[PDB]
Design a protein around this nucleic acid. Structure first.
Lengths: 117, 51, 150
RNA sequence: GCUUGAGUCUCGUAGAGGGGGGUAGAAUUCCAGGUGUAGCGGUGAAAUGCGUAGAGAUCUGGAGGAAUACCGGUGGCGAAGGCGGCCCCCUGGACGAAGACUGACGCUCAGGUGCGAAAGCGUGGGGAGCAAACAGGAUUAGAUACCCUGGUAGUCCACGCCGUAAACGAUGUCGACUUGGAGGUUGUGCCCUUGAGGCGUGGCUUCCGGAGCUAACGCGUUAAGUCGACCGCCUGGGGAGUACGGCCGCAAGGUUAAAACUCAAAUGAAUUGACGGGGGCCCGCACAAGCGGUGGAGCAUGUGGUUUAAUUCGAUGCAACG
RNA sequence: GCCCGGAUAGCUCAGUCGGUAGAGCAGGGGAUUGAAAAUCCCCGUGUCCUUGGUUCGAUUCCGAGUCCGGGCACCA
């Protein structure tokens, strides 16, 4: 019941899952979505056409205000960097600026050895 | 990476920034590092680029 | 394997002359006793009069409408495991497939006799009943219902 | 005596060469607080784990440590090992050019002295990420593993020790000769320097390759070609870089280094093929698309069993069983 | 010698207010394999340790016995 009018939307695009939260201008949570919470779980998610149905779920929780326009914050790789923005363009929302906020360091921390099969 | 266009349309312009960083220098990290594995494979893959 | 020709032109119904009804009798046929097939379906096909009272002709197609799917699965030996990537179904098999469900499920109906056990199923088709109509959604619950892979 | 070897002086050039001290920005983790709400994280799936004591996400502020994206290269510097942010201080070597100077002052070098990746050791610091050990979850016939969630030493600093590595170009140092081609990097001379530029002349360095060399692979002016000076080293495989003795070490352990006995080979490159849970391209009812079956049922038939005085002999993966 | 517990399928074990008892393994018959395993399907012939009693009926409840197991045998 605040009517933020316009607020950026963060798209935490990951591999094992993807989640988009339609925060406000300053950066306050107004409504978040989630593939894991979008019916199918396990790992069936991930896929782009699976995240789209997730972020689209926001237009059902963050619609209580009246977002007439909004930007997009895509972070991290994975099947949900495009899908999300698309579903949002159809949901009825607008757009003000697309950008990738993926954490790309300068050889700072030393990543995990991991995987070796 | 910064997009912005007048006349609402989902054209793209997005894969334009997709040539300097993007899923590349990403997966580059992803798993472990390299150390000797690179200085070597980086100097062998170079051999490839000859013909 | 790599062979690529055409379809087998089937002979139309023994009366109405229709390929759509042709392969229908064949799919229903058994032990090459094609005769019985005709005398078993061609009857129930017209016995609809007692079930309605008019030019029972389109009833067949209309009845199949409630049994015409448009999406199926298809496991694929990829990604180490086995995918499922569901895909629609061209018309060539749409009409065909349905006919199977209409018959392959009209036999387990357990009524008076195959001749009639079939008739009723048609009425149940357009009116949604029996496994015939079931198989549709029971199949759709995969494709279009699991596009996560599609 | 001489000057071309070697060296000195001058003036420039490039450089992640070294030692010290600063400093910057990105990211991670953590602490605090705001928003917000039922998921997050992870895998092939999963599960452990974290979440309603409010995570994850998001935003603000703070603490701390390690490493410096892009430039970055087939690049550069170093004796080797190795050495990448920017700045200052102390410092080494290499190279070019006009030259000026010394005058064989040189090459090599057992023993000797010193330098040595990483792991490891001692004392004291530090500790974000990563990660032997260790602990859970999973996989599996089992799984003291690979995978997942955690995680200690350690990795970082100082100072001292240990001296090894596939410490590799698996190719000792120094010098003189010997067809060529394309390229990289850095100095210098010159050319309407009118230009990106063009022609030479030095240093270092890639790739191809001729003669020759080579067992072959291949090396080929940076030689494994043609020669000269000095040094290290090898003499069949196993036993064995082991034992013993010496020396060194805090300890791991290092260095030097056998025999007994045993085998008729061990080995190197290259060839033919076979195979690969290698790659490319193909065909077959091989699969996929469907039609009908077998597997259950009663009966036929054969076989292995079991039995029998005998159950006659044979046939046994696709190629054995109407 | 004393007190407490165990004795159930071939092994190791689980189980019952008293009437017809099971699991993992081994075993066996199919399967799949070229053949073994591993895996898949279907399979328990247990006088429930002995001997007395209660009872209509005892693996079960009561007394005793053997055997095993734990503890104890001390001042002297």
């Amino acid at each position: 019941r605040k009517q933020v009018s316009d607020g950026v939307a963060h798209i935490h695009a990951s591999f094992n899952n993807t989640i988009v939260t339609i925060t406000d201008r300053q950066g306050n949570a107004l409504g978040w979505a989630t593939a894991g919470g979008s019916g199918f779980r396990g790992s069936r998610k991930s896929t782009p056409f699976a995240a789209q149905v997730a972020a689209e779920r926001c237009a059902d929780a963050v619609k209580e205000y009246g977002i007439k326009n909004l930007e997009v914050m895509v972070k991290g790789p994975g099947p949900g960097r495009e899908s999300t923005i698309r579903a949002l363009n159809a949901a009825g929302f607008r757009i003000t600026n697309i950008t990738d906020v993926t954490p790309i360091p300068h050889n700072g921390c030393r990543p995990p050895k991991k995987r070796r099969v | 990476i910064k997009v912005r266009e007048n006349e609402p349309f989902d054209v793209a312009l997005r894969r334009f920034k997709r040539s300097c960083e993007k899923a590349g220098v990403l997966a580059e990290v992803r798993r472990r590092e390299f150390y000797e594995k690179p200085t070597t494979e980086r100097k062998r893959a170079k051999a490839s680029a000859v013909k | 394997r790599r062979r690529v020709i055409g379809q087998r032109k089937i002979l139309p119904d023994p009366k109405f002359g229709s390929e759509l009804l042709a392969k229908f009798v064949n799919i229903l046929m058994v032990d090459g006793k094609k005769s019985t097939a005709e005398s078993i379906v061609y009857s129930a096909l017209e016995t609809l009069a007692q079930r309605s009272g008019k030019s029972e002709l389109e009833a067949f197609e209309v009845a199949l409408e409630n049994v015409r799917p448009t999406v199926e699965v298809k496991s694929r030996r990829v990604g180490g495991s086995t995918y499922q990537v569901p895909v629609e179904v061209r018309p060539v098999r749409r009409n065909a497939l349905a006919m199977r469900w209409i018959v392959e499920a009209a036999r387990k109906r357990g009524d008076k006799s195959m001749a009639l056990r079939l008739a009723n199923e048609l009425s149940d088709a357009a009116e949604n009943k029996g496994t015939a109509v079931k198989k549709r959604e029971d199949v759709h619950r995969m494709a279009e219902a699991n596009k996560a892979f599609a």
